[PDB]
Amino acid sequence: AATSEEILEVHTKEHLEFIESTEKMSREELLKETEKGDSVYFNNDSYA
Amino acid sequence: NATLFNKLKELQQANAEKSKLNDELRSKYQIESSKAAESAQTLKILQE
Amino acid sequence: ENSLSTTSKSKRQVIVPVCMPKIHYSPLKTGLCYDVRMRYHAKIFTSY
């Protein structure tokens, strides 16, 4: 898998903290961020 | 009418329980997934 | 058959030596990347 060092080269800190925080969210929080973004879906099993 | 309604309700009940079985398999899937990732990472460090 | 028909019983002297062929495409293979760990990420059936 990709480490943080190579993935921060083009992507920002805030996006990485966002995707790192959305790993262990609730059910309803993942559903709320799924309806928040433009045609996306998150998961508990999404980060790795 | 009675036979058709009993078939409908049995099919609805099967559709109700299969989602619960799928969610159970999803939870077991995630629990296996974390250890699978750790074993893969340790094999990578051994490889390096 | 031919009237050309070269006629000399003698061992021909060696001209070139046999070396590694100077090509760099296709004695090689084609790389493939695949892992089942991408199949972890699925969707939460939420609406119906």
Is the Cβ pair B30, A45 closer than 8 Å?
A: yes
Classify residue C14 by burial, with Cβ atoms within 10 Å: 0-12, 13-18, 19+. exposed
A44 touches chain B (CB under 8 A): yes
Residue C22: count of CB within 10 angstroms of its CB: 5
What single letter denotes the amino acid at residue B7? K
What is the experimental resolution, given in Å to one decimal place?
3.8
What single letter denotes the amino acid at residue C41? H
Is the Cβ pair C40, A27 closer than 8 Å?
A: no
**What ranges in chain A are assigned the alpha helix state H?**
4-7, 13-21, 27-36
The method of structure determination was: cryo-EM
Residue B26 and residue B38: Cα distance in Å, rounded? 19
Q: What are phi and psi of A45, to 5 degrees?
A: -95, 70
**Contact A28/A8 with Cβ under 8 angstroms?**
no
A41 touches chain C (CB under 8 A): yes
Is the Cβ pair C40, A48 closer than 8 Å?
A: yes
**Contact C25/B18 with Cβ under 8 angstroms?**
no
Residue A38 and residue C42: Cα distance in Å, rounded? 18
